[PDB]
Amino acid sequence: SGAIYVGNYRVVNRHLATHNDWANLVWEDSSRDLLVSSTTAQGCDTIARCDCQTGVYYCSSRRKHYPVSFSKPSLIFVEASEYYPARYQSHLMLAVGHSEPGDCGGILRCQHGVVGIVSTGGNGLVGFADVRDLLWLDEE
């Protein structure tokens, strides 16, 4: 689990979105595993605007933050899971690291702020859904 709270937006894994999230929908993309919903109280997170490939992510299943190198947000094939069929996920970044399904929502952060959230993984690899192209998250 986990979310990004950027102003009056809540950014979660589409596959973990609640009824309240869907009842307050701002934007969703199955191809990106992202859903954004509206909030009433403002959040304590800032979004990175950058092309950093190094950062730190939170891994719930180790209670540990790990420094990682990660790929550029790309269109990449992801093996079938409980939540999606074998498909290409868009705006995705891969790192070498530990990840389990419930680690989804863990933040990846760089010097510029929040890069993305844990989404995909397997075989000692962790995948993060990028949010840095979502400029509209920063306004209105």
Active-site residue flag, 15 = yes
Measured from the CB atom, the residue of 50 and 56 that comes closer to Zn ion is 50
Which of 97, 120, 129, 137 forms a contact with ligand LFO (CB under 6 A)?
Answer: 120
Stretch that binds ligand LFO, among 22-30, 42-50, 108-116, 119-127 (CB under 6 A): 119-127
- Could you tell me the smallest distance in angstroms from the CB atom of residue 138 to ligand LFO? 27
129 counts as binding ligand LFO under rule CB under 6 A: no
The interface partner of residue 101, options being Zn ion, ligand LFO, none and the CB cut-off 5 to 8 Å by kind, is ligand LFO
End-to-end CA distance of the chain: 26
User: Residue-wise over 77-116: b if at least 16 C-beta within 10 A, else e?
Assistant: ebeebeebeeeebbbbbbbebebeeebbbbbbbbeebbbb
Measured from the Cβ of residue 28, the count of other Cβ atoms closer than 10 Å reads 16
